[PDB]
Design an enzyme around this catalytic site. Structure first.
Site, PDB file in Angstrom:
ATOM      1  CG  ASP A 250      -0.322   0.077   2.495  1.00  0.00           C
ATOM      2  OD1 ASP A 250       0.896   0.058   2.557  1.00  0.00           O
ATOM      3  OD2 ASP A 250      -1.039   0.176   3.489  1.00  0.00           O
TER       4      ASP A 250
ATOM      5  CE  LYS B 166       3.148  -2.793  -5.508  1.00  0.00           C
ATOM      6  NZ  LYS B 166       3.343  -4.231  -5.792  1.00  0.00           N
ATOM      7  CB  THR B 167      -2.611   0.176  -7.785  1.00  0.00           C
ATOM      8  OG1 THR B 167      -2.219  -1.192  -7.816  1.00  0.00           O
ATOM      9  CG2 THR B 167      -3.901   0.315  -8.576  1.00  0.00           C
TER      10      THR B 167
ATOM     11  CG  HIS C 252      11.150 -13.372  -5.044  1.00  0.00           C
ATOM     12  ND1 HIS C 252      12.245 -12.549  -4.854  1.00  0.00           N
ATOM     13  CD2 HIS C 252      11.631 -14.509  -5.605  1.00  0.00           C
ATOM     14  CE1 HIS C 252      13.335 -13.156  -5.286  1.00  0.00           C
ATOM     15  NE2 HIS C 252      12.991 -14.354  -5.735  1.00  0.00           N
TER      16      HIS C 252
END
Ligand SMILES: [Pb+2]
Ligand SMILES: [Pb+2]
Lengths: 280, 363
Positions: free
Chosen positions: B14, B17-18, B54
């Protein structure tokens, strides 16, 4: 005292707490580092609470053996980046060591013991973290196998050396039996599975007398497939694990397999969709 | 045709990125007019993915997702780097992302310049700890959400980020500009005893008169292109992406075989041993039903042919299950032409059961 950047730096280097969290805590504490740490401790419970409803399906399985006693443990987080983090790992290891030392099989006892550490950890990592489950296996000989962090297994045996026990643990990790021997499947379960297969066989048009004999065959296959000793040994599948044990004059008296996030439904993400929704 | 750049976001769940990616698309459309997202600067077309996991990223790189040409590390300045920021950057080092740009988010919520500086220095230091050039890394002080809400100040920081995507990530090299390579598929002789080899030019250009090396499997040989053919039609050159016949000077049909490559001399070498990142298909994906172990001896399919190899698993690893991704060192039974980044399939009995990438040639 004055809330300089260097004082914030000192608190942040000491605690790993977020920069602005440190600034706020120090400011209210009049620059006293220890009181600032206490301020962040109280705040951290609320930060953790806010995260507590986040799905945490990643993390680790851990195992440890102490003679005739072994523990298997799942500790969850949200992403595998955190699962790999040294601080998260040290937390999970610390919980593991305590469960072995205290022989703790009640996950709520383990939770209570580590709730303050967990909260401080969540407050600095920013993911939900949860001590999800713990189990003990007792035995004459114990062994374990870790398939990276995601699958852990304990095996109890009789008459088996290190290598055999480990290969059996490896087999369990790969083939997930839920019983030791085929005769361990309860009469109730076998009878129900029989009715299942007979119904299926009948509706495919097999005459009753044929369907019955075929289902007898299916029941042997069924109890074989769900049991350790009935399964083909993953390292040499031309023999069952039962045959392998007999060759080494050994027996298995127990096992437990945990896999990270079992029984937690996988949430699917749609990044492109989420980006378009944001634009509004 | 407009240069294409593969980028990705990486960072805490949070830290923005989005929101940042939505801000990039909104502000560029506002400024210049009109799973992964796409957006354009006046000079570049971008395709942009997120890197939330990852293992997930590593498996996507292996199974065909375009490798990031540059990544955007998103860190909220309110926190600064998280303990796991180390792990975000380490993934970057692991896959060899060539460049990392940083976007510091929520800078509007840090009124103190000296605290923004503290965060900035932490990020530079973490980057340099993994051999990224921390001191030279573009770091943008922005606010994704406020840019998305139309605040001009913060929109300008989105345009700053896009400019760094334009300036800091080099235009990726096009296949046609790389040294000529053709993977050889079939081999014929014509009547004037001229050997012809067929294939799709992978990269570069082969002209009549140019020397080539035949590389892989056998001792490298040298020849001169005496002709290029495209469906019985005589051409003067063959280019990347074209299906051609290459006619060769003097070398005889029995001396060349499928699986070798034609190459510009001195530009590709044969190897037998390499480090790789591998993904083993799950049962549902059509792969193996059961695990394999250290004596697994499959075929590695490079370009046009199979080569048997033996494997070494990482320390501590005894077993590979369907669906795993792991590192392995491979030793082929004979050499094949290859470079870092070369994709391959893993096969048994002719069936693909895994995929991989050459991570480092060893010998
Ligand atoms: Pb029941
Ligand atoms: Pb019925």
């Amino acid at each position: 005292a004055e809330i300089t950047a260097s004082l914030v730096k000192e608190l942040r280097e000491r605690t790993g707490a977020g920069m602005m969290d440190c600034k706020k805590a120090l400011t209210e504490a009049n620059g006293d580092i220890e009181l600032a740490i206490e301020n962040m401790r109280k705040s951290g419970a609320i930060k953790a609470a806010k995260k507590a409803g986040n799905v945490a399906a990643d993390g680790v399985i851990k195992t440890k053996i102490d003679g005739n006693y072994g523990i298997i443990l799942e500790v969850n987080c949200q992403t595998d980046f955190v699962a790999k983090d040294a601080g998260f790992q040290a937390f999970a290891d610390k919980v593991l060591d305590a469960a072995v030392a205290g022989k703790i099989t009640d996950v709520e006892v383990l939770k209570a013991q580590f709730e303050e550490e967990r909260v401080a950890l969540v407050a600095k990592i920013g993911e939900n973290i949860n001590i999800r489950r713990v189990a003990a296996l007792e035995g004459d000989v114990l062994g374990s196998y870790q398939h990276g962090a995601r699958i852990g297994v304990l095996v109890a045996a009789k008459g088996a050396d290190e290598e055999l026990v480990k290969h059996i643990a490896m087999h369990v990790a790969a083939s997930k039996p839920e019983f030791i021997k085929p005769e361990d499947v309860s009469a109730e379960v076998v009878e129900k599975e029989y009715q299942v297969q007979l119904d299926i066989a009948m509706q495919s048009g097999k005459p009753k007398e044929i369907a019955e004999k075929m289902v007898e065959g299916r029941m042997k296959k069924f109890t074989g497939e769900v049991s350790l000793t009935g399964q083909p040994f993953v390292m040499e599948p031309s023999k069952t694990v039962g045959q392998l044990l007999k060759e080494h004059n050994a027996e298995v008296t127990g096992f437990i397999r945990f896999e990270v996030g079992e029984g937690i439904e996988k949430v699917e993400t749609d990044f492109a969709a989420e980006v378009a929704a944001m634009s509004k | 045709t407009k240069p294409h750049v593969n980028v990705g976001t990486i960072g805490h769940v949070d830290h923005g990125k989005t929101t940042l990616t939505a801000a990039i698309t909104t502000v560029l459309a506002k400024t210049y007019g009109g799973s992964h997202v796409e957006y354009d600067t006046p000079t570049r077309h971008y395709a942009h993915v997120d890197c939330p996991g990852h293992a997930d990223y590593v498996k996507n790189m292996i199974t065909g997702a375009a490798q990031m040409d540059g990544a955007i590390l998103v860190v909220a300045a309110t926190d600064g780097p998280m303990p796991q920021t180390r792990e975000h950057i380490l993934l970057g080092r692991q896959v060899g992302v060539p460049y990392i740009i940083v976007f510091l988010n929520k800078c509007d919520m840090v009124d103190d310049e000296e605290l923004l500086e503290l965060v900035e220095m932490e990020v530079r230091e973490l980057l340099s700890q993994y051999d990224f050039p921390g001191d030279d890394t573009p770091i943008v002080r922005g606010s994704a959400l406020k840019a998305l809400e139309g605040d001009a100040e913060w929109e300008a920081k989105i345009l700053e980020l896009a400019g760094f995507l334009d300036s800091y990530i080099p235009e990726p090299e096009r296949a046609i500009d790389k040294p000529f390579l053709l993977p050889i598929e079939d081999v014929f002789s014509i009547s004037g005893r001229g050997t012809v080899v067929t294939g799709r030019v992978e990269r570069g250009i082969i002209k009549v008169g140019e020397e080539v090396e035949i590389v892989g499997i056998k001792e490298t040989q040298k020849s001169t292109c005496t002709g290029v053919e495209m469906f019985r039609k005589l051409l003067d050159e063959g280019r990347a992406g074209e299906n051609v016949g290459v006619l060769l000077r003097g070398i005889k049909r029995e001396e060349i075989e499928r699986g070798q490559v034609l190459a510009k001399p001195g530009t590709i070498k044969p190897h037998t041993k390499f480090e790789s990142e591998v993904y083993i298909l799950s049962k549902d994906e059509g792969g193996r039903h059961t695990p394999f172990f250290k004596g697994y001896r499959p075929q590695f399919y490079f370009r046009t042919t199979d080569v048997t190899g033996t494997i070494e698993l990482p320390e501590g690893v005894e077993m590979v299950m369907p669906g795993d991704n792991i590192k392995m060192v491979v030793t082929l039974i004979h050499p094949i032409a290859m470079d870092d980044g070369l994709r391959f399939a893993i096969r048994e009995g002719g069936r693909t059961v895994g995929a991989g990438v050459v991570a480092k040639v060893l010998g």
